[PDB]
Amino acid sequence: MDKNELVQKAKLAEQAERYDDMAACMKSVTEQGAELSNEERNLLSVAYKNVVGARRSSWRVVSSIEQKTEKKQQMAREYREKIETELRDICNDVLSLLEKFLIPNASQAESKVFYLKMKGDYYRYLAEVAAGDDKKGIVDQSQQAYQEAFEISKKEMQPTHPIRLGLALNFSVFYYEILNSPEKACSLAKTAFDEAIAELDTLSEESYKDSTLIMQLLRDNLTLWTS
């Protein structure tokens, strides 16, 4: 059990697309090493992102059917409750890992920004599950997280570099889905895109691909949100 092997061993579970196995694999890396540099951190990110992604699609569909159908269909609630409790438990796992290793370790602007953004989005997924009583706490925690992330990123990462951009777009989603305020959505999204357009001469080599993709996603969301 070493990060030296697990750099590959997680890529194995990912290349097999058995992301649940990848998640246990990356958890062992994280508690062992207390760091992931800018490629190997993707492993942690993508593993947990896909594990919640499937659950969220299932939950979305199941809950849609529950509302669509008609008393007999009460079985749908049983299974939704199973999915929601899985996704809760998965997010509690992520929260406990992210707080305990991922908050205190942080020793670059990239690390501080990245994990603080991460925290907000994992709360945002809980917000999809949450009824109003839970939801208030969940959204407050997420808003704290995106704000703390934003403040650092706003000074430290010039919009020439990508992480700030994904932070801005997801921070914009967090208002638009959960707390719909199209002015707030355009305020974050359009200002960040205008900054990134001002940075557009001076994207890094990876940023020529990635930041332009993220800027395209900003135009896409802006189109939907001005509608």
Partner: protein, 178 residues
């Protein structure tokens, strides 16, 4: 859902244009123009870039359908064989109408919507066989990016068969659950 004629731009003279939609515009000389138009009027086929008309003023111009995507040259430098079949499909049409292209190369083959084919030293062997040679250089670009054994053979014949034979050649070349 959720998430987390109007002449415009110079393309390469080739311009992007507006005439009942998007159109490509290419804008001794009179003769070269007269001949091109004259030849274009005689073409009507999916694999020949669709001639739409011409202009004599304010300048001389040829208008064609706009192809979104790019040239084969641009892309490269089962789908491949299909590009080859289509490219042969249009060259056949051309020859049957006693037309020799004389300038077949991956730059003049336009890959419309990345699906449909629409028709310099490296491609030069004029006759029907000279275009066949050029086309074989295209197969070389297709297959080297720079492959059935029958396709290497066909390459080496064209590098000579005529297009019917080439076409005939290319054309000849677990459980789902409810």
């Amino acid at each position: 859902r959720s998430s987390s004629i109007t002449v415009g731009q110079r393309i390469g003279t080739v311009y992007k244009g507006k005439w009942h939609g998007d159109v490509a515009v290419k804008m001794q000389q009179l003769q070269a123009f007269k001949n091109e138009v004259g030849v274009l009027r005689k073409t009507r086929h999916v694999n020949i870039l669709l001639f739409m008309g011409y202009s004599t003023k304010p300048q001389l111009a040829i208008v064609t359908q706009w192809c979104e995507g790019s040239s084969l040259y641009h892309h490269l430098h089962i789908k491949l064989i299909d590009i080859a079949r289509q490219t042969a499909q249009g060259m056949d049409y051309l020859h049957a109408k006693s037309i020799i292209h004389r300038d077949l190369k991956s730059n003049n083959i336009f890959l419309h919507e990345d699906l449909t084919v629409k028709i310099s030293i490296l491609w030069m062997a004029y006759s029907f066989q000279s275009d066949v040679y050029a086309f074989g250089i295209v197969l070389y670009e297709l297959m080297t990016g720079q492959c059935p054994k029958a396709m290497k053979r066909l390459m080496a014949e064209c590098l000579r068969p005529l297009f019917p034979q080439i076409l005939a050649s290319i054309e000849l070349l677990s459980e789902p659950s409810l």
